[PDB]
């Protein structure tokens, strides 16, 4: 979950 929600940056 980390690494997908990081995608908005």
């Known amino acids: 979950l ?3 929600l ?3 940056l």
Request: charged share 0%.
């Open 2 to 4: 980390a690494a997908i």
């Open 6 to 8: 990081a995608q908005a």
